[PDB]
Symmetry: none
């Protein structure tokens, strides 16, 4: 059982770290997706796919739920 509405997945990861100050939110893509992934939402409301195994990705996450 699962939603029959589309679900976002990532098939590519941004190569280098996004500017930390341009990021306001994040969310992990569904476990249903083929690739694990972190999607950062920038302040201009863009959505960027990132690799959860990357050090900067984990640090950005730790920073985001301090705020």
């Amino acid at each position: 059982p699962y939603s029959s509405d589309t679900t976002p997945c990532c098939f590519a990861y941004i190569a280098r770290p996004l500017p930390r100050a341009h990021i306001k939110e994040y969310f992990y893509t569904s476990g249903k997706c083929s690739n694990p992934a972190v999607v950062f939402v920038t302040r201009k409301n863009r959505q960027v796919c990132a690799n959860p195994e990357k050090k900067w990705v984990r640090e950005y996450i730790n920073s985001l739920e301090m705020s």
Copy 2:
């Protein structure tokens, strides 16, 4: 402005009302499951099984414009 790709992991069980669908598109081949997405006037992206008769018929009607 998004790097994500919409994929489908379930198909709607019953035929969606034809009257409220404004267009359709097929989910990316990158997605594991093949699927037709019917977009409703309220911008709902509903997943449907490409092999279903009603789905093929809806697509045909949307193709004739």
Copy 3:
């Protein structure tokens, strides 16, 4: 090597699902912590510890990555 500043960890998980509409952000606690955990930041800016293995927790995360 690691930050010598304090790092937040969770030692208890909220028993039941928080109201989805009261949540604006989330972040996973450091892998350094003894327990894996998800910290939801409410709109009143409170921080609630949650279990990543819980179904509602994963769903809330998937939802937050969409907004």
Copy 4:
């Protein structure tokens, strides 16, 4: 208004300046590593090794008020 607990996973290598510390507290026993937290006037929470001489001395001075 938070359910989290501050823990320490590293100790500051050199003695922090005494002049800018307003208080201290020990991290929870729930944390895996024992630690003293020196809070600076800029609200930085710095982790320090309880066994260090300077740490015990700083604590003593903060205890005499």
